[PDB]
Amino acid sequence: KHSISDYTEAEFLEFVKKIARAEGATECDDNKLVREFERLTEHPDGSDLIYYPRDDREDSPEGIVKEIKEWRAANGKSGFKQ
Amino acid sequence: PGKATGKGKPVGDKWLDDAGKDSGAPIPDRIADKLRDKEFKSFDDFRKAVWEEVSKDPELSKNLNPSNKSSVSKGYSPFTPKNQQVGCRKVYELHHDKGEVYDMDNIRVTTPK
């Protein structure tokens, strides 16, 4: 898996759950996962989507994935693997 | 190794906002109370205990969102706002104001920037 389009939406949601639950192997693995979330999504808010979300959507892995999916689609970017 | 010492300072709901300011934030007095006179094998073990104590204190943790709560529950530092991050430094840090290693009156919570 290299870009977000290599992940199904389920796989990507399980990855956001991992981050949200701090379930990396170590603290530094969590940091790598957050940075990987940033790389994969290309969203300019980066880690703020996880930790400092806008207040007009749900603060949850669901909500984070919804925001990413909608943002990528609306901005002409590729999406999840079917 | 060393024993944690010192008093820390009263803080408010948004105390991590001060970590972004030029002073930084102090170790909260309530945390200092919990860790004083405890022995730590390393500064990393002391750092773990600080964040675990933050996670257990409803007032110091109430402004952390659920993802950040998860992090401190494991004794990990919480992530800062994106605009306070630098390089791969994305979480609050514990700096010495400089001078003893476990002196909580000598330690400030800071953002990376």
Curated annotation (Swiss-Prot), chain A:
Coiled coil: none annotated. InterPro entries: Colicin_E_sf, Colicin_pyocin. Transmembrane segments: none annotated. One of its GO terms (molecular function) is toxic substance binding. GO terms for biological process: bacteriocin immunity. Pfam families: Colicin_Pyocin. Keywords: Bacteriocin immunity, Plasmid. Belongs to the colicins ColE2/ColE8/ColE9 and pyocins S1/S2 family. This protein is able to protect a cell, which harbors the plasmid ColE2 encoding colicin E2, against colicin E2. This is Colicin-E2 immunity protein. It comes from Escherichia coli. The gene is imm.
UniProtKB/Swiss-Prot annotation, chain B:
Residues 10-21 have a biased composition (Basic and acidic residues). Zn(2+) binds at residue 95. Residues 61-74 have a biased composition (Low complexity). Residues 55-87 are annotated as: Disordered. It comes from the Bacteria. This plasmid-coded bactericidal protein is an endonuclease active on both single- and double-stranded DNA but with undefined specificity. Belongs to the colicin/pyosin nuclease family. This is Colicin-E9. The gene is col. The chain holds residues 456 to 573 of 582 of the full protein.
